[PDB]
Amino acid sequence: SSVQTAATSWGTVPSIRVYTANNGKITERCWDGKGWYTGAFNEPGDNVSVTSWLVGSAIHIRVYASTGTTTTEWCWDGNGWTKGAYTATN
Amino acid sequence: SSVQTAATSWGTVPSIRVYTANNGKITERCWDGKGWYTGAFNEPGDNVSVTSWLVGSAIHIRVYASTGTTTTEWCWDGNGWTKGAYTATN
Amino acid sequence: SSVQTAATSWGTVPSIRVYTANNGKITERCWDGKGWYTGAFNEPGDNVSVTSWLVGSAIHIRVYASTGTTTTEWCWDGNGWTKGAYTATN
Ligand SMILES: OC[C@@]1(O)OC[C@@H](O)[C@@H](O)[C@@H]1O
Ligand SMILES: OC[C@@]1(O)OC[C@@H](O)[C@@H](O)[C@@H]1O
Ligand SMILES: OC[C@@]1(O)OC[C@@H](O)[C@@H](O)[C@@H]1O
Numbered sequence: 046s047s048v049q050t051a052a053t054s055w056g057t058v059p060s061i062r063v064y065t066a067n068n069g070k071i072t073e074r075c076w077d078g079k080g081w082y083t084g085a086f087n088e089p090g091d092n093v094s095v096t097s098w099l100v101g102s103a104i105h106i107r108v109y110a111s112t113g114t115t116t117t118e119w120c121w122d123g124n125g126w127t128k129g130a131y132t133a134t135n
Numbered sequence: 136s137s138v139q140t141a142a143t144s145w146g147t148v149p150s151i152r153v154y155t156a157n158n159g160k161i162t163e164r165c166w167d168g169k170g171w172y173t174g175a176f177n178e179p180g181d182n183v184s185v186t187s188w189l190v191g192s193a194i195h196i197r198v199y200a201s202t203g204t205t206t207t208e209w210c211w212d213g214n215g216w217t218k219g220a221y222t223a224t225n
Numbered sequence: 226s227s228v229q230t231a232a233t234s235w236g237t238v239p240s241i242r243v244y245t246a247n248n249g250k251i252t253e254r255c256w257d258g259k260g261w262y263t264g265a266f267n268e269p270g271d272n273v274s275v276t277s278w279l280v281g282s283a284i285h286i287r288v289y290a291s292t293g294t295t296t297t298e299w300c301w302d303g304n305g306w307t308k309g310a311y312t313a314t315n
Contacts, residue, residue: 047293048293048294049272052287054278065291065313081311092140094140109140111155182229184231184243206245
């Protein structure tokens with residue numbers, strides 16, 4: 046068994062976020078051009094995917110964390126992570 | 136065992152598509168700014184990845200669905216899903 | 226058990242890169258508008274994710290290859306793949 050990752054990036058420098066699912070926990074490593082550091086995202090999950098988009102200079106991130114058949118969406122919109130409206134009927 | 140997801144997004148609103156592989160079947164949930172709904176994509180696969188690109192206002196999506204060592208590419212180019220030219224020698 | 230893929234794309238044609246983890250090995254298939262071909266990326270790993278960004282017309286790619294709890298970052302910046310600075314404490 047190996048960890049499972051998901052990655053997103055924005056800008057030209059760039060900024061990168063790498064999410065790793067490891068033993069049921071998803072953590073985040075961050076690059077903003079001057080070294081990797083540990084991000085504020087730490088949530089349960091066995092599987093992770095991510096997407097992001099810019100609006101001007103403002104980044105928006107969506108992380109999809111799944112355990113069993115339940116997927117939880119986590120949202121970054123400039124001022125902290127929040128749970129999103131995503132639902133699915135798996 | 137957990138489901139496995141892949142996500143893409145475009146624009147600023149934005150639009151988001153989340154693909155979930157669950158028990159050998161890949162389905163699609165969609166956001167266009169006003170609620171999540173079930174998309175037209177429903178194909179067999181144990182693993183999924185996705186990428187997309189805009190040409191002006193027109194979205195193009197590629198979904199890579201894998202079962203065993205066989206990966207099938209599915210294409211959205213504005214008027215329905217079609218099988219793509221992707222091949223690999225896995 | 227199925228192979229596991231990750232995909233990225235850039236431009237409008239577009240260019241696409243699809244990475245496949247298969248039996249501990251990650252390989253790359255490439256589209257630049259006129260057929261799929263095998264890319265120069267061939268590295269060990271049981272899991273793969275990818276992100277990319279344009280700077281003008283220059284593509285930059287980051288591939289995250291994981292075996293066990295160890296993730297290795299591979300970088301394309303226009304002139305060959307190189308190992309990146311990414312670390313994590315998994
Ligand atoms: O500046 C770092 C940070 O705020 O960037 C946005 C998100 O990736 C956060 O989890 C992360 O801590
Ligand atoms: O408007 C929704 C839709 O047409 O958007 C493009 C694709 O994601 C389709 O599967 C989906 O049904
Ligand atoms: O032109 C093809 C190529 O150079 O494109 C950039 C990377 O995807 C490489 O592995 C690949 O061989």
